[PDB]
Amino acid sequence: MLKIIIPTTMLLPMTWMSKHNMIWINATVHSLLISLISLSLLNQLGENSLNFSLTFFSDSLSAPLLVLTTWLLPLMLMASQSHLSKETTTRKKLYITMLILLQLFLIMTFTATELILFYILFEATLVPTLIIITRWGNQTERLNAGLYFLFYTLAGSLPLLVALVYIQNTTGSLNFLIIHYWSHPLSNSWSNIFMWLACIMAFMVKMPLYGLHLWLPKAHVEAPIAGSMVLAAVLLKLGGYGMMRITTILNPLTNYMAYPFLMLSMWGMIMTSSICLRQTDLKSLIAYSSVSHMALVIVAIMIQTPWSFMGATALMIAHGLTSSMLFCLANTNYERVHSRTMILARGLQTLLPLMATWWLVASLTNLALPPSINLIGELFIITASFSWSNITIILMGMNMMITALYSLYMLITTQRGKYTHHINNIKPSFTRENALMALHILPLLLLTLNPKMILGPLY
Amino acid sequence: MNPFASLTLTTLTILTIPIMMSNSNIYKTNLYPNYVKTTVSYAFTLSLVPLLMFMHTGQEMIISNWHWMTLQTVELSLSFKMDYFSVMFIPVALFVTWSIMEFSMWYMHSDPFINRFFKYLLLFLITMMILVTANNLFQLFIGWEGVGIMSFLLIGWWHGRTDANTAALQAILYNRIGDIGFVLSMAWFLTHSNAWDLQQIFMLNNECPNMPLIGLLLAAAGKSAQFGLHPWLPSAMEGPTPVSALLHSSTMVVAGVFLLIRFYPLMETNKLVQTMTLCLGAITTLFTALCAITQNDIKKIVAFSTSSQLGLMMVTIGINQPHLAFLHICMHAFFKAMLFMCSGSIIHSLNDEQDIRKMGGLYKAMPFTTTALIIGSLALTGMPYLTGFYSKDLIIEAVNMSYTNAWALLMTLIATSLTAAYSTRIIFFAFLGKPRFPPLVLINENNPLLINSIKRLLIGSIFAGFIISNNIPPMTVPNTTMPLYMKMTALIVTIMGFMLALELNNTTYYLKFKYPSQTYKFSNMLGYYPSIMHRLPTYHNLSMSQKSASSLLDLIWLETILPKTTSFIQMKMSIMVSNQKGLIKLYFLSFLITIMISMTLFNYHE
Amino acid sequence: HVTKDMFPGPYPKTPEERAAAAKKYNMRVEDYEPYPDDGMGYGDYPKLPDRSQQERDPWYDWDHPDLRLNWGEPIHWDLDMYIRNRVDTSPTPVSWNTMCKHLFGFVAFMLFMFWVGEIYPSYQPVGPKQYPYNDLYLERGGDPTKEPEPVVHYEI
Amino acid sequence: AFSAPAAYLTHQQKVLRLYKRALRHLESWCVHRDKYRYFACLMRARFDEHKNEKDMVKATQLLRQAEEEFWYGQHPQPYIFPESPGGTSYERYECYKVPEWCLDDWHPSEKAMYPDYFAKREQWKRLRRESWEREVKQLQEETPPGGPRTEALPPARKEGDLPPLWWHIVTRPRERPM
Amino acid sequence: SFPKYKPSRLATLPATLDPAEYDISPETRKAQAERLAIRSRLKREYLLQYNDPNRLGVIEDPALIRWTYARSANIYPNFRPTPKTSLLGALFGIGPLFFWYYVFKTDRDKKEKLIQEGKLDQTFNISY
Numbered sequence A: 001m002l003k004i005i006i007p008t009t010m011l012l013p014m015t016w017m018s019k020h021n022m023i024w025i026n027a028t029v030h031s032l033l034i035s036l037i038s039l040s041l042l043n044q045l046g047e048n049s050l051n052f053s054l055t056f057f058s059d060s061l062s063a064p065l066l067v068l069t070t071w072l073l074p075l076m077l078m079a080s081q082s083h084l085s086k087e088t089t090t091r092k093k094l095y096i097t098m099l100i101l102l103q104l105f106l107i108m109t110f111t112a113t114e115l116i117l118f119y120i121l122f123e124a125t126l127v128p129t130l131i132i133i134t135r136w137g138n139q140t141e142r143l144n145a146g147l148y149f150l151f152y153t154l155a156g157s158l159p160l161l162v163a164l165v166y167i168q169n170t171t172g173s174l175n176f177l178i179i180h181y182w183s184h185p186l187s188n189s190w191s192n193i194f195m196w197l198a199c200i201m202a203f204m205v206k207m208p209l210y211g212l213h214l215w216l217p218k219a220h221v222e223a224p225i226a227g228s229m230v231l232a233a234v235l236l237k238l239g240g241y242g243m244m245r246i247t248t249i250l251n252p253l254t255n256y257m258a259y260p261f262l263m264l265s266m267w268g269m270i271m272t273s274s275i276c277l278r279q280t281d282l283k284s285l286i287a288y289s290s291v292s293h294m295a296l297v298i299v300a301i302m303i304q305t306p307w308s309f310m311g312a313t314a315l316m317i318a319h320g321l322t323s324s325m326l327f328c329l330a331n332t333n334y335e336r337v338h339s340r341t342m343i344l345a346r347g348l349q350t351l352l353p354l355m356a357t358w359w360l361v362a363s364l365t366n367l368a369l370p371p372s373i374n375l376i377g378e379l380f381i382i383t384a385s386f387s388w389s390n391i392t393i394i395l396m397g398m399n400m401m402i403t404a405l406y407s408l409y410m411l412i413t414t415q416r417g418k419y420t421h422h423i424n425n426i427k428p429s430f431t432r433e434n435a436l437m438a439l440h441i442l443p444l445l446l447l448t449l450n451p452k453m454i455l456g457p458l459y
Numbered sequence B: 001m002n003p004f005a006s007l008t009l010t011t012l013t014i015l016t017i018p019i020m021m022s023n024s025n026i027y028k029t030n031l032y033p034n035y036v037k038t039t040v041s042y043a044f045t046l047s048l049v050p051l052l053m054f055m056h057t058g059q060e061m062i063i064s065n066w067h068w069m070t071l072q073t074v075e076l077s078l079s080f081k082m083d084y085f086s087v088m089f090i091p092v093a094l095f096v097t098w099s100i101m102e103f104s105m106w107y108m109h110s111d112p113f114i115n116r117f118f119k120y121l122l123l124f125l126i127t128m129m130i131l132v133t134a135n136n137l138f139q140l141f142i143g144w145e146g147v148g149i150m151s152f153l154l155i156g157w158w159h160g161r162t163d164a165n166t167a168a169l170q171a172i173l174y175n176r177i178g179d180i181g182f183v184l185s186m187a188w189f190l191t192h193s194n195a196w197d198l199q200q201i202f203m204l205n206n207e208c209p210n211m212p213l214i215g216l217l218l219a220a221a222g223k224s225a226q227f228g229l230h231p232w233l234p235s236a237m238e239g240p241t242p243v244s245a246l247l248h249s250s251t252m253v254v255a256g257v258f259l260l261i262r263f264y265p266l267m268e269t270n271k272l273v274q275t276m277t278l279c280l281g282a283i284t285t286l287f288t289a290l291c292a293i294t295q296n297d298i299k300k301i302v303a304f305s306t307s308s309q310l311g312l313m314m315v316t317i318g319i320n321q322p323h324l325a326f327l328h329i330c331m332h333a334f335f336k337a338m339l340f341m342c343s344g345s346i347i348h349s350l351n352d353e354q355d356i357r358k359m360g361g362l363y364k365a366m367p368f369t370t371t372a373l374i375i376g377s378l379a380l381t382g383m384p385y386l387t388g389f390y391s392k393d394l395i396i397e398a399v400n401m402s403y404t405n406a407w408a409l410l411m412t413l414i415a416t417s418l419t420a421a422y423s424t425r426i427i428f429f430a431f432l433g434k435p436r437f438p439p440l441v442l443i444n445e446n447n448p449l450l451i452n453s454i455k456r457l458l459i460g461s462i463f464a465g466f467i468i469s470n471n472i473p474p475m476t477v478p479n480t481t482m483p484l485y486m487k488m489t490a491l492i493v494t495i496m497g498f499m500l501a502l503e504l505n506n507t508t509y510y511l512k513f514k515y516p517s518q519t520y521k522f523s524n525m526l527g528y529y530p531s532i533m534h535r536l537p538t539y540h541n542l543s544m545s546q547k548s549a550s551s552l553l554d555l556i557w558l559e560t561i562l563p564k565t566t567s568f569i570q571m572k573m574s575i576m577v578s579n580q581k582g583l584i585k586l587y588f589l590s591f592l593i594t595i596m597i598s599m600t601l602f603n604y605h606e
Numbered sequence C: 001h002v003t004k005d006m007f008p009g010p011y012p013k014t015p016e017e018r019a020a021a022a023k024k025y026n027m028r029v030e031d032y033e034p035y036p037d038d039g040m041g042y043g044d045y046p047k048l049p050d051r052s053q054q055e056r057d058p059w060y061d062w063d064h065p066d067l068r069l070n071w072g073e074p075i076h077w078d079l080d081m082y083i084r085n086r087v088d089t090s091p092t093p094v095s096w097n098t099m100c101k102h103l104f105g106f107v108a109f110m111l112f113m114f115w116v117g118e119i120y121p122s123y124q125p126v127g128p129k130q131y132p133y134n135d136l137y138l139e140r141g142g143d144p145t146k147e148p149e150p151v152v153h154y155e156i
Numbered sequence D: 001a002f003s004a005p006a007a008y009l010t011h012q013q014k015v016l017r018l019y020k021r022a023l024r025h026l027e028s029w030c031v032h033r034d035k036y037r038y039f040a041c042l043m044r045a046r047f048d049e050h051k052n053e054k055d056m057v058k059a060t061q062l063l064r065q066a067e068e069e070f071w072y073g074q075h076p077q078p079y080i081f082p083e084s085p086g087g088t089s090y091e092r093y094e095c096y097k098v099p100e101w102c103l104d105d106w107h108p109s110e111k112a113m114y115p116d117y118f119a120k121r122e123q124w125k126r127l128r129r130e131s132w133e134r135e136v137k138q139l140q141e142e143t144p145p146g147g148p149r150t151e152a153l154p155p156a157r158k159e160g161d162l163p164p165l166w167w168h169i170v171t172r173p174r175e176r177p178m
Numbered sequence E: 001s002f003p004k005y006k007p008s009r010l011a012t013l014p015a016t017l018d019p020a021e022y023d024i025s026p027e028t029r030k031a032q033a034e035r036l037a038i039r040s041r042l043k044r045e046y047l048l049q050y051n052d053p054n055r056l057g058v059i060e061d062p063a064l065i066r067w068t069y070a071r072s073a074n075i076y077p078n079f080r081p082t083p084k085t086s087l088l089g090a091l092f093g094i095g096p097l098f099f100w101y102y103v104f105k106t107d108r109d110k111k112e113k114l115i116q117e118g119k120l121d122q123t124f125n126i127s128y
């Protein structure tokens, strides 16, 4: 796996030893090359994972996440080099260093063989994102957003550290393969209930679970574009990956310890989709979309069925790509009008037709239009939940209705009606923004032809 | 191989070539609409051959040519069903689409984005073929959603108009409501039957339970605009007249009826679902026909006529006569599309005027439009030997000769009378009398495109019923023995409708004025259903979404409990700890207290 | 360029505070009335007539024609719910509580009469249809290893 | 749409508005032309029956009763002109209306096409630039110190002056821009 | 005479049927004059920036900023725990959760009892 880690580390000396007018070109080109190299990890086996060494491995669930993480950095570099034009060379190189460190931490997180190294890197990902949000954010609320984002995660995950250390003392190891082969049930005790809670909330905070999501509308809105993209696309999926990994130790306590979380998520998807219907901020609407979509992944993980696991993996990938595209689309308008209000700049289809097409495609993908991979994941989870309980279909259908409602509401408000008379500084769409939109959207449609690559190990 | 499979796949794959050429140097030329129309005509000509093969030997196939993914036991493949319904419906849809595109070349002549309009129409046709020819539930869902999204994109064609966007979103909502039931049916058929394919579903379900069929009924009611979910179809008249003629008149709105027809082997074994479908169809065909008889916008009248015909189709399905419903779909397509083309010709010739109250004597001004619309109304009203006689009169006869809900029977008969009632109104207020339009006469129907496009479906509306009904094999036991008074029920009620509507219309010439009654207000305002259901539930939902979900729960109490409480507690504890004035006299006494406590508490019991 | 005094604040309790708030929102003191001082967080913000945007004069030359708002005028709290792409409160020719009565009565009457007709169906004076081979026992599923009860039909 | 509104409507304006509205709704009820002529002459007689009363209280009560009459007897589906706020073609062409400032964002290759039009546009822009301060000065001269009382704008009083705030009224896109 | 129209929340009272415009006072005329003066001053202030050739940027609207700030950031500082507030919050936050928990728990208990007696007709149920 070092053939991907070492180039990502070498990205840093190349960035720092580059000329002031050549940093973006080198960073983008070599990030794209690293993504091409990482594409080789999709060649998974049918029975067991790819055990590269004692430290790293790769399975059918880690490979799509790794490919998405490697593919995302070029897009963040593309989207960042517009509003960082007036920066100094040192500050630009520091921003790129933070992004590269984030990629390296995520890459080593998704392939860590043990749970302690996984925890170490899973929390090492906090400092670069926190620095990005609190340093290159635009408004004065970025400090509060950073505090919320840091403390929710740490308060949720310190008990996870305690529980993991206890598990290693009682079992002898925290290697995932040994744990999976030597699995043993939990007795229905209070101590086991609290050890279940400690091993679960660390990932529920980062999904986020409904009621524990307050940090997300702050962090995703106050962060710069690259920070928002990495928060929505990859950092939300760490909780899902960790849960699908760690429920191996948990059974059978999950059969009844998952009731409050299932209720919270299936009602919170409705609540967040309804919140999306009255939002004066576009970025906040896109942020709440993420909670509404990740509640379904929480359900799929909690019900413990192969179809739910496959749907959860597909939905995580599709949500990452779609949310990144939507955030980029909103940033394109923000860089024009310098405001986040939705009704400020309206009727933008008349002025920017190709961005209108991109908006339409992103909105169609968000509302899970067949045969999108969004639809594949959501329908698989819906079928699994119907098998779990037939009455879940009411909530699933209502959520599907409200999702399309607010998606087309966001499309029509921003792109239709008559253009505001006074915004006379709307320049034509740049080649960079169109290329960003295309590189976001083409993989989504291409993944429909080979959906087994993003369906996980249960396929 | 025999030509059946190759031709059936080719007639679908050659409809996508103009979509691929949408980025070439034909899309930036005024030749593109002609190119698309020629492609559609060639596709119709090619598809005419598998129909002939089925007409000869009843040859039918399923074609699973591509394997998509395998999830454990289940196999999802690109499978096409080329049975009687598909091979009979594709040529009719292609013929109607060819006529509508030739009409669009004239009606959308001054549109700056006509090429885009043609691309959109083609996309809708492709999605409809995908829906119709689908063999598995996932492919049929793909078509189901594609036709809905194309409806959304074509209703809001003039995206500067607020009401077009409102109507498009309304259609999307009313179709998602039935999409809920579609997803219910898919989930039930997958967990219970372990397959999404039609062959497996039929085999494993010899006595089908309620849930999947009720989900299918909900989806069909959403798509076909039944009484619960009806109002979106009349609102869908915001888009251009060709869109209303092609999508919301003859091809899209029959998708729910088609879905219910495809699952008739499972609906044969359920009687409660059949009763529900019968009642829903009867109430829809009554209510929309009652709403149509007081409408002044011609497009709204024809939309309500379409909704009433869809209700009649659902009635036909609900009496265990699905082949009659498919036949009625095929017959109704012709003359209803022709009626919309005539109405659009009238609208274009009167400078975008849609109200019949400003339409006067057009019987002599537009002779061909009047002839076409008279023939269409006669076909629509089940005039004997017209294309509508071979379907609608047989439907009425079957409903009379069945173990049927009596209220549904009476409602169907009253709707049959109201059809002639509203049809008379369009003719009376549109073609008879003295002119009521502005004096600058711009009337002109001497365009070969309009004439030929209308004439093709005119010949169709005249001869298609006889041509088709005598050529399909018999899949129905007939009603050979009937009393004479019941054999002529439909004709009698249509004649009574004609006479009563004509009398009440002729009453308008009298120099007498009177204020409207409450029945007229109920009928004209669509039963107040949009006046209530478009204001009360929407207001309550949008107010709870902000007052409760956004403000009270998310911004106040979820903030209060976890972060604000801990912040307050830490602030209070920090203040409590940090305010000592630095006087040794106090904390040395505290040291003494601590020392004393330690000895007794922790020392005297080790 | 909005400084500290131009933002909404807490509920005004004295006449001077109410006058200052009315000046802030470009309103007449005789027209300015905030929401009731409960714990909903409305605070300083003014309460305006719950009129929709469809009721606003369409022939006035607004600064924003589609929204039907002027530039500096105060904005309703629920503007995004009354954007006239949404909930409409315009007067109707028929009064409320009368539209509801007629619609509910029509729906209930239709349901009741459908139930009544289900209780009293309509059929023809004929006997049940007869099928030859043991009521098509083999064709309706098969099971040829039980020799079912033979049903026999006679000419009449 | 072109006139600055007043603070309130006078009694005469309200009566005229009601007369026009009642005539329109009666025409909606009376589809045929001769019947509408008959009942419109009757309507004119009904309005002229009370035109000469000098008592304002009774006239206002008559107006109230007339408004109640109209609201009870109005047509639920009155005729609307196609381009009217309720018409079927009200905002059909608003997506084709592009503001004039978008022409400054064109590529030089696009402006190579249509050179004469862009020369005329350049001289129009020069004319707009040369007149702004005079318009501002006239506006700040002819208004009361306590802010304007009406939305009405003054004309150009001198010879080298253009009416103040004219650019966006003169450079409307079109009704049919395409 | 004729049946009277009564306004509602979603069908409001027309201006022509509202008595306030048929009993007018000089106070009302003064109020209307001042309202028109305010609107005219705001319109002039907007149009002066709108027609300026020199400016090339979005024109700031303090009303929109006030609206968004009040709807988003100004809510918590003006929040007081009151009986109505606490009751509404507790209901809308907790009641649905326990309602759905009860429904799903009863449904799954019934299904499990049916499984333990072998009565669901679970043939062909393979994918779960």
Ligand SMILES: CCCCCCCCCCCCCCCCCC(=O)OC[C@H](COP(=O)([O-])OCC(O)COP(=O)([O-])OC[C@@H](COC(=O)CCCCCCCCCCCCCCCCC)OC(=O)CCCCCCCCCCCCCCCCC)OC(=O)CCCCCCCCCCCCCCCCC
Binding pocket: B290, B293, B294, B413, B414, B417, B418, B421, B492, B493, B496, B497, B500, B501, B504, B505, B514, B515, B516, B517, B518, B519, B520, B521, B523, C101, C102, C104, C105, C106, C109
């Ligand atoms: C074969 C043996 C069996 C024989 C069967 C019978 C034989 C023949 C019998 C003939 C009987 C009369 C047929 C004509 C009916 C009346 C025609 C008519 O329009 O008269 C106008 C007249 C007044 O009109 P207007 O307001 O002065 O019009 C103003 C302008 O002229 C406006 O002018 P415009 O330009 O807008 O034009 C208006 C337009 C629209 O006209 C209207 O405004 C009225 C339209 C609605 C009535 C149409 C009949 C529909 C009946 C459906 C009933 C379904 C059950 C509903 C249950 C609801 C329960 C709540 O005019 C038309 O559409 C033409 C008239 C209708 C043409 C079709 C007539 C024939 C079909 C019906 C008879 C079928 C005969 C064969 C049957 C075969 C099988 C038995 O109203 C009526 O006469 C109809 C009233 C009957 C329904 C009343 C329902 C009760 C309402 C209040 C109930 C109490 C509620 C208490 C509160 C409860 C709250 C919960």
Ligand SMILES: CCCCCCCCCCCCCCCCC[C@@H](O)O[C@H](CO[C@H](O)CCCCCCCCCCCCCCC)COP(=O)(O)OCC[N+](C)(C)C
Binding pocket: A188, A189, A190, A193, A209, A210, A211, A212, A257, A260
């Ligand atoms: C804002 C939202 C953020 C996320 C919140 C997550 C919620 C976490 C809660 C997880 C639920 C499980 C916790 C305890 C398990 C069962 C609780 C209890 O109701 O079960 C009964 C237990 O009976 C009594 O209720 C004992 C519990 C009483 C003390 C708990 C009070 C908690 C009420 C409020 C909790 C608030 C949670 C959030 C804290 C901030 C069952 O009776 P019994 O079969 O005999 O005992 C089974 C346990 N055995 C097997 C070990 C013996």
Ligand SMILES: CCCCCCCC/C=C\CCCCCCCC(=O)O[C@H](COC(=O)CCCCCCC/C=C/CCCCCCCC)COP(=O)(O)OCCN
Binding pocket: A151, A152, A153, A155, A156, A159, A162, A163, A166, A190, A191, A192, A194, A195, A196, A197, A198, A201, A205, A212
């Ligand atoms: C942003 C908010 C998130 C906050 C999450 C905080 C709650 C996390 C869940 C519980 C955390 C503490 C659990 C302890 C860590 C696991 C240790 C373990 O598993 O071993 C247990 C230890 O069990 C315990 O000691 C439990 C101690 C619990 C005390 C602290 C309670 C804190 C509050 C509990 C509820 C919080 C969980 C949900 C809250 C969600 C946020 C509102 C077995 O004990 P033994 O020594 O083996 O004895 C048995 C054999 N003789």
